[PDB]
């Protein structure tokens, strides 16, 4: 079903230290697979997932070139961006760029996006129909009128509806082995006393993929957010993710509290409890 091809590009100017730094990271779903960094020992597009450790030199040279070229474009762009804002080379600035395509359950194009951000704030967005650009500012107007006039939407739309999709499929294929595997979370509940009156119940979800997951506590079979806490999902570092949910309970009421875990890799949602 659902799957996505996404890239995240960052360019950061260093004013008396040469050309700005340029990084590109590629994801298929929640799996990174390539990267380019013009500061790495090898300033080339390089594989970041096992199933790309084979790809011919041709793919790599192509991508190293594409990233390089963009670095240059972005170098010019950082200088232009500084004029729209009335900026000297005094400080360093960031141009961000993201784009991706998403397939619906049928394995076909469902949505594409692309945007630009300057110094962390939205600057230019491709519209939802991929036909034109919107200055998400009024200082980005020149950029909007210039890209709408030169008909630049069209090249991005081709990439996002075709190329990106085509390639999304090659990558799934190259990595079907692991990319389509749904690793369910190893769940368990731990007990951490706070005092004689209360203690913390912590419900653990570990080693799962994809990152999407839902942890909730219930008390006596009712939704329960009072004295609840949920951490952001984090990467285990091995490709999988982690997450935990916490609820403050009175001594001897623990068996009233059940944790529920929803994940795409579980045949059905799991219900947990502290075994004492």
């Amino acid at each position: 079903g659902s799957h996505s091809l996404k890239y995240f590009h960052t360019s950061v100017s260093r004013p008396g230290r040469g050309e700005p730094r340029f990084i590109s990271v590629g994801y298929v779903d929640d799996t990174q697979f390539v990267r380019f960094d013009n500061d790495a020992a090898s300033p080339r597009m390089v594989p970041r997932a096992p199933w790309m450790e084979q790809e011919g030199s041709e793919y790599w040279d192509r991508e190293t070139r594409s990233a390089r070229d963009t670095a240059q474009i972005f170098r010019v762009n950082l200088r232009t961006l500084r004029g729209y804002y009335n900026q000297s080379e005094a400080g360093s600035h960031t141009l961000q760029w993201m784009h991706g395509c998403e397939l619906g359950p049928d394995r076909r194009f469902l949505r594409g996006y692309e945007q630009f951000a300057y110094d962390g704030k939205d600057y230019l967005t491709l519209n939802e129909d991929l036909r034109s650009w919107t200055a998400v500012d009024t200082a980005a107007q020149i950029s909007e009128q210039k890209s709408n006039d030169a008909s630049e939407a069209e090249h991005q739309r081709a990439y996002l509806e075709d190329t990106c999709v085509e390639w999304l499929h090659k990558y799934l294929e190259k990595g079907k082995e692991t990319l389509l595997h749904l690793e369910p979370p190893k769940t368990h509940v731990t007990h951490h006393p706070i005092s004689d009156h209360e203690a913390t119940l912590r419900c653990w979800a570990l080693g799962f993929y994809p990152a999407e997951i839902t942890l909730t506590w219930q008390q006596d079979g009712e939704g329960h957010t009072q004295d609840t806490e949920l951490v952001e999902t984090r990467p285990a570092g091995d490709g999988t993710f982690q997450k935990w949910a916490a609820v403050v309970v009175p001594s001897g009421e623990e068996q009233r509290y059940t944790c529920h875990v929803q994940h795409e890799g579980l045949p059905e949602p799991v219900t947990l409890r502290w075994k004492p």
């Binding site: 890239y7 070229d69 474009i73 762009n77 230019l124 890209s147 991005q156 990439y159």
Partner: peptide, 9 residues
């Protein structure tokens, strides 16, 4: 692959 053409702002 990544997008082949990056806008000049």
């Amino acid at each position: 692959v990544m997008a082949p053409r990056a806008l000049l702002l």
